[PDB]
Amino acid sequence: LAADAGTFLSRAVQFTEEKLGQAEKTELDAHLENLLSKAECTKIWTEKIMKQTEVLLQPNPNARIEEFVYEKLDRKAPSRINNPELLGQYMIDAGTEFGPGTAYGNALIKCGETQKRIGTADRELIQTSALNFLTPLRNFIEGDYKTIAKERKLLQNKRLDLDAAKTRLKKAKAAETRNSSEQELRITQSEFDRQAEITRLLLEGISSTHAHHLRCLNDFVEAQMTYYAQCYQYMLDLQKQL
Template sequence: MLGSYVFAIYYSHVFEELFAFRVMLLLFLLSKFTGEKFGQVEKTELDAHFENLLSRADSTKNWTEKIFRQTEVLLQPNPSSRIEEFLYEKLDRTVPSRPNNEELLGHYMQDAAKDFGPGTPYGSTLIKVGDCERRLGSVQREFLQTSAISFLTPLRNFLEGDWRTISKERRLLENRRLDLDSCKARLKKAKLAESKAAAVPDFQETRPRNYVLSASASALWSEEVDKAEHELRVAQTEFDRQAEVTRLLLEGISSTHVNHLRCLHEFVEAQTAYYKQCHLHMQDLQKELDRFPNAFAGNPGHSMASGGSSPLDPASAVETDTLKIEEVQAPATGTRKAKVLYDYDAADTSELSLLADELITVYTVPGMDSDWLVGERGNQKGKVPVTYLELLS
């Protein structure tokens, strides 16, 4: 039941347009019928300027409607959410505040970081990225609100306000035109009958009654002509008055264009500010991530992408076998102290597990990948990733 109600409200404007189209079609058919009924009377034509105003108004309405609908899709791609917002608006109620996609993603990332451990490289990165996503969501929410007020609302006000008034007056003008055409046809018919009745009678007619009847008919049709002329003057006055009202409304389309132009500038400014803030947030995020260790240091895919050798590559395997970490001896010079930045779990026996904030001795040996160092902690020895360390002088 509620779904049917929502559908009916949301598409009410479609039904209104369909009804208006049917009315115009009925008026068109009526005008055709009127013309055929009253001796093929010609339709009262509007001047070229008026026709241009009508064409310009129709074009404005059609394109405004398309721009409005597509902007709605841009700002809210989810059709269900659009219908819900439309329903709340028609019921004059506030739309419930819900997190958008960016805010929801940021929330999930931060919850995942708590589960994985905020002190791990992955967890700490999730926290940073999640916080950035939530800021992006907040910026997007502000952009949507600004765009709805400064751009969508004026377009909607035109379609639901000014255009409905114009359409109403145009339908009234069409009715006045039909009345005028009908009066013209009636006058034409009356004059034709009067001319026939006023034809000069035959005074030699042996039956004078025919002459009397002809004179009486001529007088009757003369009265009918006077009445038709009066009705025509009234219809012409009403038509001219309605045409003037409609013309003034149609000329107001120029002011509508000016207003929509201003709104369009505000929409562009809102978009510019939105994308600029998004760009700044992403730049800040990248700078923060650059201060973190490279999370892909131990990832085989990253080593291959950066041109280095992967531990899974045959060449790397040969290096590991050749080096035999347990047999590597610390050089007499070249060793350094390093502070561990993050916990690290050794992937195999050739690597050394690390704990954040501990100090270890590190050094390099010939043939080892530049992303790795040999680390020592007491009697323990193994490869450690460079990006997890802060080398001390």
């Protein structure tokens, strides 16, 4: 068990010396370097788009903060009526008060109805998009990315060990000890190579990620089309009655 502490100690000292610039870093194969870089960029942008999308869907930030609170509180956040439907209610009530016979009353009541219909259509889009877009992406970021991160750490650690061994051999004098260090060097190199393959294999899966997301984007688009199309028709209908 204490030997493990020695491994942690060895990995640390080496990390310090390498940072001190006194020690160098064994550069990884260009292919893996390229693969890791691509996966990262992908995650960064996907995260940004997902967030901005959400903001677009739910403009009120304070509402989002309240949801976060109840989410951490493990409680349900009370539902609220959307602005479009609310306006409709006020208008309809006014129209009624002003008098249904009056044209102004007729117009106000007619509009309030259209507004509520529009509000209903809005919620349809929010649910449709959330179900078809945000979640698919979220999945990828939470699962595959995590796994890759873990493997990255393993390979990073192995490299530290390899570099530490190298440095040890560099300062190896006693023939017998130097030979032992040579055995140690062979030992770490093998393990390092093994993890490198493991990592490359996992990184290969990212290729399909882009194609999967493209489908999700096509869906979101269809949703927006549906939302505006419905609202446009609703508006036309209102003008005919008024």
